[PDB]
């Protein structure tokens, strides 16, 4: 690792600087270096890791969608042939995206998940594992697409089971996990009814627990509750 010679604390400091500068590739590289120091991550550090790679893969996904759309049009009836270039460049972006996903999944497997014993860390990492298998699923078309989808499902399911046993229904990690697993159902697993049921049940159970919260916790929970409602409105 090119970050092997840098202090852990310096890597975390520079990840925060990179965030302020909107340099998310750098941020991700710094946080990968921090993970590879081998110590567990604090709550703040876990969110630095997720923010960094979410921004990196988010841009890749947006670019892949643009290129896939152009490629699909080039393959409609009546479209002038323009050669292999659209497919090639879509493939280039796709391979880079798969590489980022594999990197994140590698960090989770070596060895963040196995050392995560508290619910807040273990659910967080298993949600990430589901998310990055979901991004692999979005571009998958081969012999292993079903296995990629089931890897996402399995990670989300383990995270869901822990979150329901160990966290209140308003916990923002529990809420965000449910939000994203619901999207997995709708967009990946061809299960819109499951997606809608999960979003609605998560929203209603959170609603009933808001009375227990401080003003600041209320703000955090209702933010994600509104995303659940937004998706329900999109889907119904």
């Amino acid at each position: 690792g090119a970050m092997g010679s840098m202090e852990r604390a310096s890597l975390i400091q520079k990840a925060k600087l990179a965030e302020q500068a909107e340099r998310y590739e750098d941020m991700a590289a710094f946080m990968k270096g921090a993970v590879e120091k081998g110590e567990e991550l604090s709550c703040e550090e876990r969110n630095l890791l997720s923010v960094a790679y979410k921004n990196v893969v988010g841009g890749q996904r947006a670019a892949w969608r643009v290129l896939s759309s152009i490629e699909q049009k080039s393959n409609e009836e009546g479209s002038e042939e323009k050669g292999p270039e659209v497919r090639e460049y879509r493939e280039k972006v796709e391979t880079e995206l798969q590489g980022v996903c594999d990197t994140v999944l590698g960090l989770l497997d070596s060895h963040l998940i196995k050392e995560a014993g508290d619910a807040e860390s273990r659910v967080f990492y298993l949600k990430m594992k589901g998310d990055y298998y979901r991004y692999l699923a979005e571009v998958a078309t081969g012999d292993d697409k079903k296995r990629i989808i089931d890897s996402a499902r399995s990670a989300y399911q383990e995270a869901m089971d822990i979150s329901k046993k160990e966290m209140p229904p308003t916990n923002p990690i529990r809420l965000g996990l449910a939000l994203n697993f619901s999207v997995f159902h709708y967009e990946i697993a061809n299960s819109p009814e499951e997606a809608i049921s999960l979003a609605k049940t998560t929203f209603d159970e959170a609603m009933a627990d808001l009375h227990t919260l401080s003003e600041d916790s209320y703000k955090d929970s209702t933010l994600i509750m509104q995303l659940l409602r937004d998706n329900l409105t999109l889907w119904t």
Partner: peptide
């Protein structure tokens, strides 16, 4: 696209 976090 739908919202994820």
């Amino acid at each position: 696209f739908p919202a994820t976090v």
